[PDB]
Structure 1
Amino acid sequence: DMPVERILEAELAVEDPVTNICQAADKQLFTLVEWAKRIPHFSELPLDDQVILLRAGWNELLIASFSHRSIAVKDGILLATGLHVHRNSAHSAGVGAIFDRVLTELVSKMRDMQMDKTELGCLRAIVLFNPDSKGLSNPAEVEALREKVYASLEAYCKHKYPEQPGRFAKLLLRLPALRSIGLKCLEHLFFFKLIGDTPIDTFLMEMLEA
């Protein structure tokens, strides 16, 4: 059993444009570890398994945290450092194409359906409890845990949005979007450090580190 509130408790308890974006992400990774330890049963896993899930997941877990929090601002992103990055700001830094992907595939669909925080935290716990991640000492423990989240998400969506029967499936069907933009964000960060013209701080660099 993982109650959906404790998941809401976890989301709540932690709260050149590209240089500011990467700085915003570096300090959210410190945040990310403290959130995960708040997800029920996560700290029960083998520690190396905990490591694997976070290194496999961090990329999409951060995208989904700032996408949801940017539903208030229009045509822009609200960074964790309090700064707003408008679309034009990003376009004339040269990251326009992927910045728009986030705007049209995630924040707008988040806004347009009014996805709430509880639902956000469940999707983040689904992304965290990823059973196909290489090298887990027991992917079926993780899998059982992913089954507890999606069960606790369906029951939530129907008790509270009974007039929206397709809502729970609408949530799950943005996860392919989150994975596809997770990967292009990574292609970008490796290209940034290849070029060497973009400062990268020590926790973010470690996540890029092999």
Structure 2
Amino acid sequence: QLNPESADLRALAKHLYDSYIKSFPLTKAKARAILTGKTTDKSPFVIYDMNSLMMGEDKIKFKHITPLQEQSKEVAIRIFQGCQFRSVEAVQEITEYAKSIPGFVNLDLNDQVTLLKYGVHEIIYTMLASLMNKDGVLISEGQGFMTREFLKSLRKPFGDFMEPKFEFAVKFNALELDDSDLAIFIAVIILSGDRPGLLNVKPIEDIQDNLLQALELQLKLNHPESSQLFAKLLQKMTDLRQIVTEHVQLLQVIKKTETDMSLHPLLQEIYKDL
């Protein structure tokens, strides 16, 4: 029965979950509630083509999304500008979450930065899965839903950015994880220790050990019938890396085909020598 040690690991879990809800406006629970439509008040406006996209701007928010524009001959780029600024915002959120992880702020400032530098995108694609289903992704805080088929057409350089995310999403979602799980998983991810350039690895590893211990307990307590979910979830981390590198390769292509498109310093500092 309940051990004194597992007692500490549950508190850590409740803490991270609590911090997660506090740091992320749109949880997986709200996303699913919107997608599985158990509502008449949360249904999103669907974008699957230009006209609906046109209607989209009309029916929903997002002008704050993409700033430097009156438009631009291309929808493909306009969308890119949006997903770009929104990533900026996610780093911001993830960064606020990191600070709540016990021990993270007590680490060397240079290592805190490197952990975020590499962990940010692996985290972004994990959570992005929460907003997806095999047919599309929620947008503008849940008010919209852009179809997977619209995105895959977009163009030639851009109709290839999201497919790998859906690929991972459909599979990662198969694990049926909920917010309380993801909160700890997201923590492990940031607290790697094998991140290129860490000055002091040991302290990071001890924090992760503990976080790994919290996740293990949490996964078995929340999914008793799910055999080896822990091991199965960890293996998923390799799918996140390929998403990342496959993405960077894509970005580099953008930097040449679109010399007129501005990116974003933050995202650039993140990618710089990644």
- The Cα shift of 1:189 comes to 2.1
Contact 1:54–1:128 (Cα < 8 Å) also in 2: yes
The question of whether the paired residues in 1 share the 8 Å contact of 2:151 and 2:162 is answered with yes
Match of 1:172, SS? Answer: helix
Report the Cα offset of residue 98 of structure 1. Answer: 4.6
Q: Secondary structure at the match of 1:173?
A: helix
Residue type matched to 1:166 in 2? Q
What TM-score does the superposition give when structure 1 sets the normalisation length?
0.87
Mapping 1:121-132, distance limit 5 Å = 121-132=183-194
- Tell whether 2:112 aligns with 1:103: no
Label 1:42 to 1:115 Cα distance change in 2 as closer, same or farther (>3 A).
same
Contact 2:115 2:190 in 1 (8 A): yes
What residue identity is the alignment partner of 1:116? Answer: D
Identical columns (%): 25
Match of 2:21 among 12, 35, 40: 12
Q: Is the 8 A contact 1:24 1:80 kept in 2?
A: no
- In the comparison of the two structures, how many residue pairs are matched? 207
In structure 2, C-alpha distance between the alignment counterparts of 1:192 and 1:50, rounded to whole Å: 29
Deviations 1:14-73 (A, max 9, x none): 2222222112112222222111111221111111110111112112111112112325xx
What amino acid sits opposite 1:77 in the alignment? V
Q: Work out which of the two has the higher radius of gyration on C-alpha atoms and give 1 or 2.
A: 2
| Distance of aligned partners of 1:10 and 1:198 in 2 relative to their CA distance in 1, 3 Å threshold | farther
Query: What's the counterpart of residue 63 of structure 2?
Result: none
Alignment of 1:172-183 (within 5 A): 172-183=234-245
Higher RCO (CA < 8 A, seq sep 6+): 1
Q: Which residue of 1 aligns with 2:97?
A: 35
Alpha-carbon separation, structure 2, partners of 1:163 and 1:209:
43
1:86 has 2:95 as partner = no
Partner SS for 2:162: helix
Is the partner of 1:137 in helix, strand or coil?
Answer: coil
Q: Is residue 42–residue 50 contact of structure 1 (8 Å, CA) maintained in 2? A: yes
Relative to structure 1, the CA distance from residue 84 to residue 202 in structure 2 (aligned partners, 3 Å threshold; closer, same or farther) is farther
Report the TM-score when normalising by structure 2: 0.68
Matched position secondary structure for 2:137: strand
Shift, 1:99, TM fit: 2.0
Q: Which moved more, 1:126-135 or 1:92-101?
A: 92-101
1:80, distance to aligned residue in structure 2 (A): 5.8
Could you say if the C-alpha distance between residues 151 and 205 of structure 1 is closer, same or farther in structure 2, counting changes exceeding 3 Å? same
Partners of 2:119 and 2:190 within 8 A in 1: yes
Mapped pair 1:164 → 2:226: yes
Q: How does 1:27-66 map to 2 (within 5 A)?
A: 27-66=89-128
State how far apart, in whole Å, the 2-side matches of 1:190 and 1:33 are. 25
Gaps of 5+ in 2: 1-7, 25-75
- State the distance in 2 between where 1:79 and 1:66 align: 10
Match of 2:268 among 202, 205, 210: 205
CA RMSD of aligned residues (A): 2.1
Shift of 1:113: 2.6
SS in 2 for 1:37: helix
Unmatched runs of 5 consecutive residues or more in structure 1: none
Counterpart of 2:228, as a letter, is G
Moved more, 164-173 or 78-87: 78-87
Residue type of the alignment partner of 2:13: V
AA matched with 1:168: F
What is the one-letter code of the residue matched to 1:157? L
